[PDB]
């Protein structure tokens, strides 16, 4: 069920490598750290690919954090229910800037207890998203995977997806 698309052309260097093209559909068999095992859907060839040369070609709607048709002030109530906490987050289609996305994360502060902060995910050319121009991402899956492990810039760490 797990499918990626190649961002770059790669020409093998090690024995066991799979070579591939920009725009090629590969399917993942194993995820060992930095060299994943894949089968190309174009040739049928198998081998190890460099992890950062590919992005998830897997539907966003199955993902726990992605709340398709949701609105700013609701995202704030969605998060403000019991069952959630600081670090709880979600991504939602931008009602304002159509074509776009926003990030809603519950946060704590001494003073006004518990804010829910919104951020703007800016679009890149073709393969890309970002929140800080310092790091750019090929897809939403890769953005989310980076910030749940580091907060760099964000005013919290993305602890948990929103629980409905």
């Amino acid at each position: 069920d797990n499918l990626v698309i190649a961002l770059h052309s790669y020409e093998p260097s090690h024995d066991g490598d799979l070579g591939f093209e920009k725009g090629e559909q590969l399917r993942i068999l194993e995820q060992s750290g930095e060299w994943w095992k894949a089968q190309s859907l174009t040739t049928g060839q198998e081998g190890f690919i460099p992890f950062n040369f590919v992005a998830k070609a897997n539907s966003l709607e199955p993902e726990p954090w992605f709340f398709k048709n949701l609105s700013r002030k609701d995202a704030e109530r969605q998060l403000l229910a019991p069952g959630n906490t600081h670090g709880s987050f979600l991504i939602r289609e931008s009602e304002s800037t159509a074509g776009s996305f926003s990030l809603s994360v519950r946060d704590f502060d001494q003073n006004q207890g518990e804010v829910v902060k919104h951020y703007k995910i800016r679009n890149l050319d073709n393969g890309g998203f970002y929140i800080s121009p310092r790091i750019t991402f090929p897809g939403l899956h890769e953005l989310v995977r980076h910030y749940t492990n580091a907060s760099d810039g964000l005013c919290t760490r993305l602890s948990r997806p929103c629980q409905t």
């Binding site: 951020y119 703007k120 929140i131 005013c155």
Partner: peptide, 9 residues
């Protein structure tokens, strides 16, 4: 635009 927070960079 219309802007939320300030873009962390």
């Amino acid at each position: 635009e219309g802007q939320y927070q300030p873009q962390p960079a």
